[PDB]
Every structure is written in structure tokens, then in C-alpha cells.
Amino acid sequence: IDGKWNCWSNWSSCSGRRKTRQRQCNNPPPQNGGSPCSGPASETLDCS
Amino acid sequence: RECNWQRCPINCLLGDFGPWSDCDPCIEKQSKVRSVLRPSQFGGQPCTAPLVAFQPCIPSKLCKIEEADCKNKFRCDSGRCIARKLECNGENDCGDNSDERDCGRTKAVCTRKYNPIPSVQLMGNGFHFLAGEPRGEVLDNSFTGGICKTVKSSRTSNPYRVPANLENVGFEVQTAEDDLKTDFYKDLTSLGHNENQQGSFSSRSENINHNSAFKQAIQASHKKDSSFIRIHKVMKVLNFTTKAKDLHLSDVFLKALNHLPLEYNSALYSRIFDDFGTHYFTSGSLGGVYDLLYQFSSEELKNSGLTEEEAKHCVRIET
Amino acid sequence: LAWEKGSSGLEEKTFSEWLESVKENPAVIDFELAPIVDLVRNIPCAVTKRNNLRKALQEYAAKFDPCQCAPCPNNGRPTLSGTECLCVCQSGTYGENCEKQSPDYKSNAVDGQWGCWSSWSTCDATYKRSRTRECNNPAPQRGGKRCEGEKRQEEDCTFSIMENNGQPCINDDEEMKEVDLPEIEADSGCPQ
Amino acid sequence: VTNLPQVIKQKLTPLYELVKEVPCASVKKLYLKWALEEYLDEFDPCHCRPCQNGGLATVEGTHCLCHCKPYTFGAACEQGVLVGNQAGGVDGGWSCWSSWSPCVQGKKTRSRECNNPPPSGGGRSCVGETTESTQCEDEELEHLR
Amino acid sequence: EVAHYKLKPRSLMLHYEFLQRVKRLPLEYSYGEYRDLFRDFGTHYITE
Amino acid sequence: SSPVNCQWDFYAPWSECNGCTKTQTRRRSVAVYGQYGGQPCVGNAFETQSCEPTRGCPTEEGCGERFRCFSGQCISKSLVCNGDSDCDEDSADEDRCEDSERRPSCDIDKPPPNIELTGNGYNELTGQFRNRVINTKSFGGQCRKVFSGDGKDFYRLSGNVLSYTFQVKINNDFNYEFYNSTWSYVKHTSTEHTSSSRKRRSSSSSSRSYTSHTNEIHKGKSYQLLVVENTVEVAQFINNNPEFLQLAEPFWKELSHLPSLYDYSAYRRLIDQYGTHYLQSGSLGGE
Ligand SMILES: *[C@@H]1O[C@H](CO)[C@@H](O)[C@H](O)[C@H]1NC(C)=O
Ligand SMILES: *[C@@H]1O[C@H](CO)[C@@H](O)[C@H](O)[C@@H]1O
């Protein structure tokens, strides 16, 4: 099985803002899958 | 064996930029030069910081370049004065068509389609003598001269037309440098040994006996065959001479030469040599080359070997 | 023909079909050169732009003469694009700048080639400057051979005399006009 | 191929040399230069801690990628085996310039010192110059204005 | 790879069916009418 | 090696305030580049805010004595109704001319088969070609023609090309390298006994063989081939220097949209579309 995340959490508050992702059903380890990932497992930015 | 055979990379060095030259009116620029302290070679970092600079600049004199009146020669719309004979020529001697654009019945266009001499525009390129490569299109070697003179390559060939920049061309077939060199090295070894041995010994009543023996045979070899073949052929299918006088310069060359400032500028007149090259072919072998090096190595090794050994040790006792 | 591996030596079928195709599109294999700046006759200010263009070729050579390249391996001629040197190779030498040899070519070792001129030695006591070059790219050591073309130059110590003030426009045909017809003369006045 | 070519070998001029017959072209030429210099300052592979096994880095936008050598693979080119002749060791490669020193006598300076894992195992020294010095920008500020 | 396309950066001339949904978008914000433009005409335009 | 996630720098100090847009852009350059399978910097390499400029928007200027196309590029009046498309994209020089006023510019319309690639831009650091920079086909009302000795055809050349040559070269290099190996081996041993004893009546007897054998084989083979080959059909194609190159309409539009104040974000947009360099000369051929 090849991995992909759930939908990412929309944002946290302003003054520094964060988005987060999980693979709970999706994950490779069941029946010995392939790559889990293609980008950043967590994400954050300035508000402006 | 060799490794890093290719020699140590010289990285480029350039001097400090000079002054901004006396500001050139007609180009409306001033040029800042720099020189080379060592070129790049064997793969070193190029002169990647660009080798020349131009600054936009206010003039400080009028431009003094003339217009050409050219004594009844025909001024084409891009400014070339072609020969008066070519007015209403037919074909197109200006490139611009200005020679023919509005006319009555033209002068005689040739009695047929004729192809030009093969690769003939190479005879009209320039050569950068410092860099060992072509530059420019110095002559328009598709200029027809308003005439239908022709050369035949073979009975099987179509006829070919001579552009007016060439004093003569010959078709031939030649080999003019011819080289075949070949080497063979062959080496064989055959080695072997084979052997046998035997022996036996002997010595209440008590008695003892012994026997032993051996055998071997072996054969081995190495072989090498390595062979080389270099063939270099220089073949000279065309030979040519470009005229001594009145050569027809290419549109794109005749443009740049007019554009150059009348007052000197090192960078502006220098780009003519990057663009058009340093020298042109007055005569030359429009030929073919084949160069071929075939190197071969073959090497081989073999073995066979056999052995046996035996021993026996016996005793009797009685009373 | 270029695809042919060559183990047989030349396959005359392919070599002849290629050679017939060479009649149909050649390449320049050897050549005899005249300098670009001799050509030009059409342009306005021809003579002036010509003078300047010789003069630029002198400076261009002083800057880009491949004598300044490090010694070429295996007796190639050094050649310089402007920003990199590459060596032009001899038959039996190859690689990017001639670093390696066919097994026959190793026998030559003749090795006769120049390094750059020194700057000008100032006037020789008959007012002529001069300069010399020293055969000093990788020297004629194991074999022996002269570098080609005269080792030294002599050049009159010429310099400028007058306030520079730009340049005049000059064209080849004009100067021999000892006589020309009386002008349209609209400022009527009188002739002599 | 004679009827459908591609470009095979190239000699280059910097793009900024083209800017002509637009408003402020005089200035735009220098600004496209400084922007190209700054583009190169983003893009130069010096930002990338070098690929192993002779692979050359390149900058993706805000990111590094590797042009690996054949049948050696992965993001750093660590996995697999090379093919063809090999020199051994690790040939040296630069980390990015220390940002230009303030002007003296009309010239800046900058220094790069091969601070990534050094030329090692007999590998050749980093290909380039440790230090550069360049004339300052004050002629744009005074003249083009 | 026997053609390469690049679209101009701007000064573009629109297909009239797109242009007419764009002239039908509200200046007020309410996501559903804007959603139909992405359904009918895509999220991004192909530039190279 | 450990995966490197990207890090943003702190922002630059905005910009000179843009006279046309009435905005300012601040750069967010890179402190650490992502490497080794680690993340690129999430979000935007720039941001932009409104700003009241002391800077003017530059006006933009037409052609005077020269004709003007719909884009704003300028072209000689001697190229109006020349019947070529002299205006690069919109051919306003060919709008509503009379067939009595029209004339032939040349016998043919066909260029050398990919002259287009000669006018492309070039990104040195990705190594790739970039979009149309030089107009490769400003014929310029001229009938500069060449017979190609390869593909056997006549072609038309532009005044933008310094030289289109029609030389051929093909250079081939082959390396083929081969190994093969094989082995076989045998070993044997035996160790043996007998004894017999009789006493008076009673007797006993015995015998033995320990015996053993081993063999092995191996083989290994490898074969490695390289070919590199080049073809050319024009070998110096030379583009002119910038004094005589005529530019592509959208590239020249971008040069007009470039802000004339130093917005780094604005100047990147040309560099990403058109690269770092133009091809000044080269070989058009094959590999
Ligand atoms: C050209 O080579 C031929 C041999 O093909 C020779 O006969 C001819 O005179 C040479 N042409 C000239 C005049 O260079
Ligand atoms: C949520 O946020 C980013 C936006 O930058 C998405 O692209 C991604 O799906 C992440 O999980």
C-alpha cells in the first residue's frame, strides 16, 4: 500500500498559523507497503 | 592505470574593470573593458562574471557618418548599392527586391531551375583564427550575379550554378591525406606438469607392513590478442577560390559594419570578431573527413588440475 | 558511415554511399585565410571603419591570442573562445583538449610550440620598438622541433601627436577627385 | 533530424543585454542584471550540501534536487552503483559566498572557502576561486538618474 | 516530445463561454457561484 | 543523510514603492534550503501590500516616424504591406492592404526546420531552454535564401541570424567492455579400517569407511556499452548581438511591464519565463 494523508486541519489562530495531517487508515505498514509521504507531515506560516 | 588524466582545472581570472570609455554618440553608450589574467581550461570555472559592460550615456558631439551616393549603382532599401546592370534584373539581387519591385518585362532570368554549388555558404562564412571555429556569414554565397554560368559534378548529377563570389570551383574525388595504421599483439602460454610416486616397507610372533602412493597432472594457459586499426581519410570532393575583388557581403554583416561608430571603441569593434570572425576562406577544400579508431583487446585464462594420494598401515600378532 | 564500428576496416559499400553524399554536402577540411578587414568596400566611412577594425584585431589578439593558454597536451594547437581555451588535436590524439593518444602517436614527441610575446622592449637605438617569443609551451625535450613563424617583431615606436577630437568619415573611391563639375551654386555670387 | 532538429551546443550572452526600446530600458538593463545576479544567488547549487557519487545539485524553487550519475540513485545519490570509469575519493565543492564586504576604493570583496565536506580520498580540489572582488554600484545611482 | 506550447503571460483574448460566466459572478462573496466557474472552466489556465 | 526541511529568512525591507500598482513587495529569501527528501518552504516567497508612491508609474511610448503594431513594438514604414508578417504576432502591417499595392517579398516562406529553437532563452542553472526571446523570423522584407545540402530543400533566413551555415558533422564514440569468468572444483577423502581376532573357540571382526566429498562452481559476466553521437545540419547558427536582434512580442511586453523600480518579485517573472541567457550561437542538429 502507498501512503496519503487525511484532509489537513484548516488553520490555527493568527500571529503564526499551523496546519496538521495524519494517515491513520491510509498508512503503509499494514501488509508491508511503500512510501508514506510526498510533502510536509505538518505545515506553518506567518499570518501576514 | 591512469586516473584524472585530464589536467588541473585553470579557473578564469579577469582584471579590474577599466574606465568608461569616451561616450559614443551614435550608439549613445560608454563601454568599460576588462582583460584576461588567465583563461579557463581543463574544465575550470568560466569567466562567468560577464567580460564587458556598457552604460547608457549622453553624447558630446554630432554623428559624422555619411550617406552613399554610389555613382549610379542601385541603392536597395536596406542601403546596399548593387551593380547598375541588375536594375530590373529578374531574380532578387537586393535581397530587399528593390531592384525589381516595380518594373516592365525584366532582363533574362535563367532558362531553368539550377541548384547552387553544394555547401557554398560555408565558403562565405568567417573563421575565428584564435578559436579554431567558424563565425559570421561574411559573404552572401547565394548571390547569383544576374548570370547563368554552371559546372557539372558528374554525368548522373544535375547541373550546378556558380555564385559570383567564386573565381573558380572544381569537383573531384581525392584522398589527400590517407592513413591506415594497424597493430597486433598476440601472446600464448601453455604450462603443465604430471607426476607419480610409490613405496612400501616391512618389519609372541609379531609383523608390520606399509604402502603409499601419489599421482598428479595439471595444465594451464593465458592468451592475449589485442589489435588496433586507425584509419584517417581526408577526401576533397570540392575545391574553390573566392574572388580577389568586389565580393558580395551578407545582409547581416553589411548591417553591422555600417552600425559601428566612426570614432574607435574597443568593445564595439571587438564584437565584430565574436560575431563575424577574424578571417575568411580565400581557397579551401570543401571535402569530407573520416577518422576512425578501432581499438580491440582480448585476454583469456584457463586451468585444469588433478590429484590422488594413498596410504596403508598393517599389523599381525600371534602366540 | 559514422555508425560503422570499424573492426573490418572500411566497408566500401557504406564508405562509397557516404562519399557520394559528401559530394551532396561537404565540410571545410583545410583552408587558406585572409583577414576579414581586407574585404569591406560598400559601407559609408569604409576606410575609417577598416582602420579601426585592423586596430581592434590587434587589441583582440593581444587579449585573446591562445599563447596565454597553459601548454596543450600531446602537441595540439591552443585555441581560445574568449573565455576558455581548448586544444585543436593532431591525427591520433583525442579527448576534450587532446589529453590522450592512439598507440602509434606516442612515438612522435616532437613538441615545437610558442608561449606569448613579452611586452615591447622600447626603442632599439634606431627608434624601432620590438618584442620576442620563447618557444616555451611544453618544450622540444624527448624529440626535437622548431615552433613556426618569426620569433621577433620590429615596429617603429609610433605614437600620437594631436588632440584626438573624434574621427573623420573616409570612403575608398573619393580621394582621387582632383577635378569635379561646378556645383548648383544657389548662393549665386561669382567664381574666380 | 535534418528535417526536425534541436539545439545541441550553445554559446551564451546574459539575458539582460537584450533590453531595448521599452520605457526606462537604460535602468532596466542594470536592474535585470542585479536581478539575474540575485536569481543566480538563489539558484546557485552552492546552497545544497553536495550530492554523493559525483551527482551535481540544482535548485528547485526554494529546494534542492540532484542530477545523479547513472544507476546511482536517491535524493542525495547515496544508493546503488556507478557505471563507467571512476576516480575514487570525493572531489571538492563550494558552499555559497560570504555576502559582499562594504566598499573600499570603489570595490567590494566576497569569500567562499569549500566549507562543505572537503576534497577527500585524493579527490580534486574545488573548481573555482576562493575570493572575488567587484566594482561598486555608485555609477548607476549617480549616472542613470 | 515533438511540440512545446507556451501561452502569452497576459493581454489574453478569452473564450466567450468563460467570459460570460465571469460577467455573471457576484461582487459579493458567496462561494457556490464561483465554484461553478472552476467546474466549467478549470482551476488554473495552462501557460507552458 | 538526514532530511533537511526548509527555513524562511526574516523578510527584506519591503521595496521601492511601485508607481503603477501603488504597492510594495517584500522578499522572503531562504535561510536553509530543503534537501535529502525534506520539505520545501511552505507558502509564498513574497508578499505585497498597498502603498502610496512618490514614484511615478512610467508612461509607455510609441513609434513616431516608425509604424506601430497593436502590441506597441515599432517597425519601419518600408515594412508596411511588405506581405510578410513583420509585426511579430498581430501583423498590423498586413491589415486591409490592396492586392494592387501588394508585392512578393520572396519566392518561399519556409525557414530551416526548427529555426525557432535558436531564438529561445536559456536557464543556465536548471540547464533547460526557455521561451521565445528573439524573433527568429523577422524576415525584414528580404529574400536571403539557402539551399540545404541536407534534407535537400531551399530555405529563407531572417536578418536576426548572423549565419546559417548548412555544414554537416557527425561524431561517434563507442566503448564496449566485456568480462566473463568460470570455475569448478572437487575434493574427496576416505579413511578406513579392518581388524580380526581369534582365541581358543572364540572370535570377532570389524571394518570401517569414513568417506567425504565437496564441490563448487562460480561464473560471472558483465558487458557495458556506451555510445555518444552528435549530428549537425547547421553548425554555427549565430544570432546577432543585441543591436540587431528584434524581440518576441510577449517578451518585449514583459520588458515594458517590468516596473523600473527594483521589485525583485517582478523581475523574477521574466527570468523564470525567459531564463538567464540567450543562445548567442550554437549547433542545430541532433544528439
Ligand atoms: C583542386 O584540387 C584539384 C584536384 O581535385 C586540382 O586539380 C585543382 O587544381 C585544385 N584547384 C585549385 C586551383 O585550387
Ligand atoms: C494543508 O495546507 C496546505 C496549504 O498550504 C495544503 O496544501 C495541504 O493539503 C496541507 O495539508
Ligand SMILES: *[C@@H]1O[C@H](CO)[C@@H](O)[C@H](O)[C@@H]1O
Ligand atoms: C520595509 O521596511 C523597512 C524597515 O527598515 C523600510 O526601511 C523599507 O522602506 C520598507 O518599507
